[PDB]
């Protein structure tokens, strides 16, 4: 036998159902979520880090001059200078005349620490959905298994079959472009493909983790050495990666709506509570029993002792009962005005017991069924003072309803009386002739 329903999506709150199979004793089942792990479909774009400039040893000549050539290197540079007359330690200083020799080539490549800290850019698409569920029905204990979310993929837990999803909404917390660094992500929605920005966020963009091309600029510039001392001055913009490190905005894990964290490795967006789920479960037929083996329940009386609406179980009521024989059978509230803390209760001859429940209404009016038997427990008013409540404009109190019906009735009475008087006046004239 199988059963279908719709369940609101929330990680903590359980769900209690009571399946009916005519000619058999009812069975109740209890299902509770543990996770909701949205997973997107992603691909890498490139990585970036802090750069480093290196310079090979320059070359000079005691006389004459040479010319430098351009080589295929990322932001390669070379240039020549004139009239050096250099100097060395206790040396002849490598000059006798106008020198006019200087190489001063410059060279850019990735840093040695790029292997550890490095932003990554990504493109994002919808991807899959999956969760995990802990289950218990009849007398079987807690059983847990995971399952995808779509109205097609079965999964067996113990001896039951499950078909859940798809979700009621297509909402997601990600955008088309994201960036991942260190431990968290950001909606830095505008990386750049091949165009750097002279050190704003892209100035060293390795297409892969160990590529050999860095299609971005650093605005490197050379300078003329002075005072005849062998060195290679230069100048360049400071790395923009540092600047973005200093001015990162709010990380996504502190702005996501609906209160859902963000794991890293699969880019899990866990627990993001929204909407409802269509559920459909089948239980084996070996867990039912003949309807003539259960104690018949009759002569019921439910009395409300004390209650108060709060996020915890703040309601207690008692029931008096006349049994057929001793046994145990479950209890449940099909209506949603109040939730029943208890699930199943034992019964003795001439039963009389109590339970617990939460609610959200001043005057609870919930009606419960037990052991194939109905009973209304209209309760009373409860004094005022995270968990399952309705809050469906059903808080109109006795005085509130009293006043509203009073004013409505008064308005109706006066208008109808006036309408009657109009035709009362008219019919006289209609009779005068």
């Amino acid at each position: 036998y199988e059963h279908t329903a719709v369940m609101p999506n929330k990680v903590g709150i359980p769900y209690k159902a009571l399946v009916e199979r005519p000619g058999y004793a009812p069975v109740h089942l209890q299902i509770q979520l543990v996770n909701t792990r949205i997973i997107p479909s992603t691909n890498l774009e490139y990585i970036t880090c802090k750069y480093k400039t290196k310079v090979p040893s320059p070359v000079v000549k005691c006389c004459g001059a040479t010319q430098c050539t351009s080589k295929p290197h990322p932001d390669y540079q070379c240039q020549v200078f004139s009239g050096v007359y250099p100097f060395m330690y206790g040396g002849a200083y490598c000059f006798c005349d106008t020198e006019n020799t200087q190489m001063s080539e410059a060279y850019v490549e990735r840093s040695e620490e790029c292997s550890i800290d490095h932003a990554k850019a990504y493109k994002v698409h919808t991807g899959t959905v999956q969760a995990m569920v802990n289950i218990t029905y009849g007398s079987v204990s807690w059983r847990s298994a995971d399952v995808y979310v779509n109205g097609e993929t079965p999964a067996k837990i113990g001896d039951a079959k499950l078909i859940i999803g798809p979700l009621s909404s297509a909402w997601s917390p990600f955008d088309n472009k994201v960036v991942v660094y260190g431990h968290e992500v950001y909606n830095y929605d505008f990386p750049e493909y091949g165009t750097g920005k002279a050190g704003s966020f892209g100035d060293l963009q390795s297409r892969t983790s160990t590529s050999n091309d860095l299609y971005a600029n650093t605005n490197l510039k050379l300078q003329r050495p002075q005072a005849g001392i062998v060195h290679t001055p230069f100048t360049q913009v400071p790395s923009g990666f540092e600047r973005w490190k200093k001015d990162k905005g709010a990380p996504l894990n502190d702005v996501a709506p609906f209160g859902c964290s963000i794991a890293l490795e699969p880019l899990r967006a866990e627990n993001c509570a929204v909407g409802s789920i269509p559920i459909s479960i089948d239980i084996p037929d070996a867990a039912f029993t003949r309807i003539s083996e259960t104690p018949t329940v009759s002569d019921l009386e439910c009395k409300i002792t004390e209650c108060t609406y709060a996020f915890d179980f703040g309601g207690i009521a008692t029931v008096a009962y006349k049994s057929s024989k001793a046994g145990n059978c479950p209890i449940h509230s099909p209506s949603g005005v109040a939730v029943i803390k208890e699930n199943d209760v034992t019964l003795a001859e001439s039963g009389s017991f109590t339970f617990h429940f939460s609610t959200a209404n001043i005057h609870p009016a919930f009606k419960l069924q037990v052991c194939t038997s109905a009973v209304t427990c209209k309760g009373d008013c409860k004094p005022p003072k995270q968990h399952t409540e309705s809050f469906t404009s059903a808080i109109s109190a006795t005085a509130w309803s009293w006043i509203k019906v009073l004013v409505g009735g008064t308005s109706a009475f006066i208008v109808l009386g006036l309408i009657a008087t109009a035709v009362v006046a008219l019919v006289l004239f209609f009779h005068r002739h």
Partner: protein, 99 residues
């Protein structure tokens, strides 16, 4: 900070985060004379109560003024038969006086 039914969460330094579901507040009371019941029906929902009160007073006053206009019109209709009053005729013995 302003918490609500949906709850709020915060962090501090290197301490792990924390959440609070602040609610359940009952300033006022729903029983007794109209004024205190109104103040409870006010403070319960911080603003939707207020807008509900404004709407309710508007609708009740417009209903009352419509009723009184209908009263006046019906009164005019009840005045109309007294066209026979200037005629100096037999009394009619009705809700109005006639010598």
């Amino acid at each position: 900070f302003t918490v609500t039914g949906e709850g709020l969460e915060y962090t501090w330094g290197n301490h792990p985060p924390k959440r609070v579901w602040a609610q359940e507040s009952g300033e006022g009371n729903p029983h007794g004379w109209p004024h205190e019941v109104v103040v409870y029906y006010y403070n319960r929902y911080p603003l939707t109560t207020i807008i509900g009160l404004c709407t309710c007073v508007a609708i009740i006053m417009v209903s009352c003024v419509t009723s009184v206009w209908l009263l006046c019109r019906t009164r005019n209709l009840c005045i109309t038969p007294y066209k026979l009053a200037p005629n100096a005729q037999v009394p009619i013995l009705l809700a109005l006086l006639c010598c």
